[PDB]
Design a protein around this ligand. Structure first.
Ligand SMILES: CC(=O)N[C@@H]1[C@@H](O[C@@H]2O[C@H](CO)[C@H](O)[C@H](O[C@]3(C(=O)O)C[C@H](O)[C@@H](NC(C)=O)[C@H]([C@H](O)[C@H](O)CO)O3)[C@H]2O)[C@H](O[C@@H]2O[C@@H](C)[C@@H](O)[C@@H](O)[C@@H]2O)[C@@H](CO)O[C@H]1O
Lengths: 216, 214
């Protein structure tokens, strides 16, 4: 099976540099031409760079937006393709994918070009309401507030609770920090007997929080 | 640059229905056209290359057609796992260029949301800001309106919301809205209300709390 795995992303300041790498397996790497493609909500998918195989002497090609700033290269002995990004701009922010012959894709690596500093979240309870009366359904959750950059993940009860969970897209606040909520619906009759813990991970700041959410 | 235009931008279809979506280039691209499916948070997956060649491992309900400038992808009979965003790519020339995507979602019956309001936590208030949250759980279709009121004053410009997608477990949407106030302003008012309008509700539903009342 073909496997591709990008690495090297994260937060970098405007004007900075970052090198992405893509490790490949499951095909004859030296015969493959490879591409970098990036994605954002604002622009959709955008082709970034291509490097040929031996048949065209490893010819390289670039989107006009990155010409002179980005360089694609490969090391066949390592089965790696690389993207060196210099003079980075805010609009270079996005998820960067490596692909073989536009046929198989890596999982992507998120590149955030921003002058803002890393900040871990505060985690606040969304506590189930005292008005209720049971035999019905209650909702509870966690508000993961004021973090940068993306992403955050949330689980409930260390992954033991998945039905009824909704973890929402984050919103970018006017402060430049993100906020996200995660909720679950549960029987109101369970509130006195079941424990509910949201497990929040903000890898960009190495922040992990387990927040127990209780009524009142 | 070759401009790629997909149509429709978004649509719904019922389980089993035939679906056809189009991708048109601004010049002849010689069938160097691929189609891809993408789920939220995941990479593209290539379905079809050179206009009509299926990638190994892709189900045969997918097929591609066209030549010159005009291309189409057909799902002969939709399966639940086929929801997602479909993209096209031309690779006849440099730069390679992409269409804007077609979002495909699954039809289901109308569902009115259950609505929940959450006060700011005491923990958050300690540091000067209050977030009030309104949850709309499991509704369909997606169009919904949240109106926030504070002592009957309509709030505008001080809320943000986001919505979940359909996925393998859920065919409805859910929506979270956060109203942000300063702690000082939060403590000056009593009645916090979230009013929800949705086609599945006979009349708008309001959920509210009074600050400082159990
Ligand atoms: C197989 C290979 O790497 N061949 C290269 C050759 O690249 C091929 O060029 C053709 C031109 O008709 C075409 O662009 C091939 O692309 C596709 C295809 O549409 O056939 C893309 C598909 O995603 C891919 N599918 C899968 C599942 O991998 C297929 C598939 O590999 C082949 O059909 C199998 O034979 O390929 C492309 O692979 C390359 O040609 C140069 O680079 C091309 C990208 C294009 O710009 C050409 O104009 C250009 O001459 C040559 C020279 O480096 O070397 C061969 O080895």
């Amino acid at each position: 099976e073909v496997k591709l795995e990008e690495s090297g992303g994260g937060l970098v300041q405007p004007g900075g540099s970052m090198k992405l790498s893509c490790a490949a397996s499951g095909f004859t790497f030296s015969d493959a031409w490879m591409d970098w493609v990036r994605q954002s909500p604002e622009k959709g998918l955008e082709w970034v760079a291509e490097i040929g195989n031996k048949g065209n002497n490893h010819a390289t090609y670039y989107a006009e937006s990155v010409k002179g700033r980005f360089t694609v290269s490969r090391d066949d002995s390592k089965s790696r393709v690389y993207l060196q990004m210099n003079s980075l701009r805010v609009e270079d922010t996005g998820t960067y994918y490596c692909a073989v012959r536009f046929a198989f894709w890596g999982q992507g690596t998120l590149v955030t070009v921003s002058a803002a500093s890393t900040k871990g979240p505060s985690v606040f309870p969304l506590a189930p309401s005292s008005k209720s009366t049971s035999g019905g359904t209650a909702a509870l959750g966690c508000l993961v507030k004021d973090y940068f950059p993306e992403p955050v993940t949330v689980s409930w009860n260390s992954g033991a609770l998945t039905s009824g969970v909704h973890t929402f897209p984050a919103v970018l606040q006017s402060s430049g920090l993100y906020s996200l909520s995660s909720v679950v619906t549960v029987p109101s009759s369970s509130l006195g007997t079941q424990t509910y813990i949201c497990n929040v991970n903000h890898k960009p700041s190495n922040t992990k929080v387990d927040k127990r959410v209780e009524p009142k | 640059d070759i401009k790629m235009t997909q149509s429709p931008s978004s649509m719904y279809a019922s389980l089993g229905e035939r679906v056809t979506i189009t991708c048109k280039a601004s010049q002849d691209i010689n069938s160097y056209l691929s189609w891809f499916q993408q789920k939220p948070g995941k990479p593209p997956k290539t379905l079809i290359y050179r206009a009509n060649r299926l990638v190994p491992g892709v189900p045969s309900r997918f097929s591609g057609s066209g030549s010159g400038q005009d291309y189409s992808l057909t799902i002969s009979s939709l399966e639940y796992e086929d929801m997602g965003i479909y993209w096209c790519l031309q690779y006849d020339e440099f730069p390679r260029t992409w269409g804007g995507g077609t979002k495909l979602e699954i039809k289901r019956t109308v569902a009115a949301p259950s609505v929940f309001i959450f006060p700011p936590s005491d923990e958050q208030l300690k540091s000067g800001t209050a977030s009030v949250v309104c949850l709309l759980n499991n509704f369909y279709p997606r169009e919904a309106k949240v109106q926030w009121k504070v002592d009957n004053a309509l709030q505008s410009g001080n809320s943000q919301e986001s919505v979940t997608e359909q996925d393998s477990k859920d065919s409805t949407y859910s929506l979270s809205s956060t109203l942000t106030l300063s702690k000082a302003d939060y403590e000056k008012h009593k009645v916090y209300a979230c009013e929800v309008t949705h086609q599945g509700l006979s009349s708008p539903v309001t959920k509210s709390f009074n600050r400082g009342e159990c």
